[PDB]
Scaffold this active site. Structure first.
Site, PDB file in Angstrom:
ATOM      1  N   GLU A  35       4.902   2.314  -9.905  1.00 35.82           N
ATOM      2  CA  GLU A  35       4.642   1.621  -8.637  1.00 35.82           C
ATOM      3  C   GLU A  35       5.864   1.739  -7.724  1.00 35.82           C
ATOM      4  OE1 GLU A  35       2.004   0.646  -7.465  1.00 35.82           O
ATOM      5  OE2 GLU A  35       0.628   0.296  -9.178  1.00 35.82           O
ATOM      6  N   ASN A  46      -0.560   0.747   3.217  1.00 34.69           N
ATOM      7  CA  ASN A  46      -1.905   1.190   2.811  1.00 34.69           C
ATOM      8  C   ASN A  46      -2.643   1.664   4.062  1.00 34.69           C
ATOM      9  OD1 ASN A  46      -1.655  -1.553   0.541  1.00 34.69           O
ATOM     10  ND2 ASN A  46      -1.269   0.619   0.092  1.00 34.69           N
ATOM     11  N   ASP A  48      -5.491   0.766   5.109  1.00 33.86           N
ATOM     12  CA  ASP A  48      -6.266  -0.382   5.653  1.00 33.86           C
ATOM     13  C   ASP A  48      -5.338  -1.301   6.458  1.00 33.86           C
ATOM     14  OD1 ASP A  48      -4.890  -1.932   3.709  1.00 33.86           O
ATOM     15  OD2 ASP A  48      -6.687  -2.694   2.782  1.00 33.86           O
ATOM     16  N   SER A  50      -2.750  -3.042   5.214  1.00 29.15           N
ATOM     17  CA  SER A  50      -1.980  -3.929   4.312  1.00 29.15           C
ATOM     18  C   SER A  50      -0.737  -3.142   3.874  1.00 29.15           C
ATOM     19  CB  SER A  50      -2.771  -4.389   3.118  1.00 29.15           C
ATOM     20  OG  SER A  50      -3.137  -3.269   2.314  1.00 29.15           O
ATOM     21  N   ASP A  52       2.153  -2.893   0.406  1.00 29.86           N
ATOM     22  CA  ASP A  52       2.515  -3.211  -0.999  1.00 29.86           C
ATOM     23  C   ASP A  52       4.035  -3.457  -1.048  1.00 29.86           C
ATOM     24  OD1 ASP A  52      -0.176  -2.630  -1.675  1.00 29.86           O
ATOM     25  OD2 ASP A  52       0.308  -0.783  -2.739  1.00 29.86           O
ATOM     26  N   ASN A  59       0.145  -6.419  -3.031  1.00 29.76           N
ATOM     27  CA  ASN A  59      -0.553  -6.074  -1.772  1.00 29.76           C
ATOM     28  C   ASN A  59      -0.712  -7.325  -0.897  1.00 29.76           C
ATOM     29  OD1 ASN A  59      -2.245  -5.092   0.216  1.00 29.76           O
ATOM     30  ND2 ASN A  59      -3.569  -3.927  -1.160  1.00 29.76           N
ATOM     31  N   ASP A 101      -6.785 -12.297 -12.760  1.00 27.72           N
ATOM     32  CA  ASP A 101      -7.854 -12.357 -11.720  1.00 27.72           C
ATOM     33  C   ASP A 101      -9.184 -11.824 -12.271  1.00 27.72           C
ATOM     34  OD1 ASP A 101      -8.612 -13.024  -8.864  1.00 27.72           O
ATOM     35  OD2 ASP A 101      -8.992 -10.875  -8.776  1.00 27.72           O
TER      36      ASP A 101
END
Ligand code: NA
Length: 129
Positions: A35, A46, A48, A50, A52, A59, A101
């Site tokens: 990562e 990202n 979209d 967003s 990280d 995120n 989650d």
């Protein structure tokens, strides 16, 4: 901060990540390697819009607030900047919520694609833990 492999393994263990939700410490070190390359200051935008953040590339879509991700949540109740600290406590706390989650470590697509099913113990091999 750029951690060493065994230095990060120790920090994750001290913060209770080792075998958290059944994921051995090498799984967490492997995810961090791919990562962030163990860099706490890693950021990546990202498509979209967003972003990280940090050693585990958490995120802004769901987990932290950066003020620039429309429609997003802040489920770890932290500014995304806290995920960039030399102290990994905020990243570890938030990673515990993510991995709880429902999809375990599959939340980290780099873990699914590069760590899952591999010899992850290699990542903590020779570390004094
Ligand atoms: Na957010």
């Amino acid at each position: 901060k750029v951690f060493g492999r065994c230095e990060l393994a120790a920090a994750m263990k001290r913060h209770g990540l080792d075998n958290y939700r059944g994921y051995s410490l090498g799984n967490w070190v492997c995810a961090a390697k791919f990562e962030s390359n163990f860099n706490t200051q890693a950021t990546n935008r990202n498509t979209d819009g967003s972003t990280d953040y940090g050693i585990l590339q958490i995120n802004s879509r769901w987990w932290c607030n950066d003020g620039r991700t429309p429609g997003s949540r802040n489920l770890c109740n932290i500014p995304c900047s806290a995920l960039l600290s030399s102290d990994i406590t905020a990243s570890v706390n938030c990673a515990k919520k993510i991995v709880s989650d429902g999809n375990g470590m599959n939340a980290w697509v780099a873990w699914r694609n590069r760590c899952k099913g591999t010899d992850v113990q290699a990542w903590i091999r020779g570390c004094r833990l």
